[PDB]
Amino acid sequence: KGEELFTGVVPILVELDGDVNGHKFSVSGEGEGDATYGKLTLKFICTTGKLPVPWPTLVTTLVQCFSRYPDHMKQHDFFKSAMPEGYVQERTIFFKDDGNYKTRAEVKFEGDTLVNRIELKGIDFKEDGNILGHKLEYNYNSHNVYIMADKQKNGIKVNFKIRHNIEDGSVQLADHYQQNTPIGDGPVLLPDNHYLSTQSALSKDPNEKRDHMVLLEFVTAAGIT
């Protein structure tokens, strides 16, 4: 029944309060999602000036309930089944040879709007490194997001590695550990092992003067026959 809420275009708002190596900042996001096509059309602005980290590093943190689950896989859609009460999303993110992010968020309907409210805490970053040094190219790769059931917590465990392009041709890995748990006490669909396939494109609004990110992204579930 939670899946019924995603039959069409849903408006989306994202709010993030971030702290990285002392530098505090906030990002606000606006746009739409349509799970029929696994599609997100969003725009993000830093509402506290210059963003202290590169935009690509915040993507994963800034709504997997909008992933396209094909017909023969809808049994395995935890994110939608947790709706509208929602779910808690928690991550630890380890940047190879560098600092780490930890994040907690709630994803739920506030009205007819699906909202993602985020707290991010970053520690142990090099000031001359790829992150705080801003040596990441402004784009994004495609990834495989691996999902497991977690009956213990009545939720899911999810794992993956983000590949960040570095301006000198090398790559910076970001190792993602995450778990999701229902906020409501209703039942939820616990899935067999599978993954999400992700595609994103980063771009710039020509008429936007604030530090910002335009994000188009497509996600589909897979790995079950």
Next chain:
Amino acid sequence: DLGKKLLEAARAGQDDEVRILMANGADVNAADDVGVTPLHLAAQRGHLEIVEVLLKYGADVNAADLWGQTPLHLAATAGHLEIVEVLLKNGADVNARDNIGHTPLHLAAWAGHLEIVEVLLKYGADVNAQDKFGKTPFDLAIDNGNEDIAEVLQKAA
């Protein structure tokens, strides 16, 4: 004032209200802060009569939002066959690329709309076009198990 009403009428599918607004001087090429036009919204939601009215008043058929999407991208995605035809007859760029490098043929083949794939091909859709992640419409057809579409694309190269 007028532009905002037109976007809303077009989104809601209110053909009669759209005709009045145009007659009362509304900007046919009005655009919100993310670059979306009334023709975008009509085309996306399948409102044929509104699409035809907007085009008659000189709507930019190839207008692109911030995500690089044109009305043709959206109609081909949603499976609105007649609107896709109208857009192409009215000069729509058949091989326009959104910010992921999707062409209308990519989206139609992905979303499973066979008849639209055939219209796009009929109007010269580039079968060998690659999106930002190297995927061809054929690649997207097999990824999503649309074998009929994968076949027609195969015999079109």
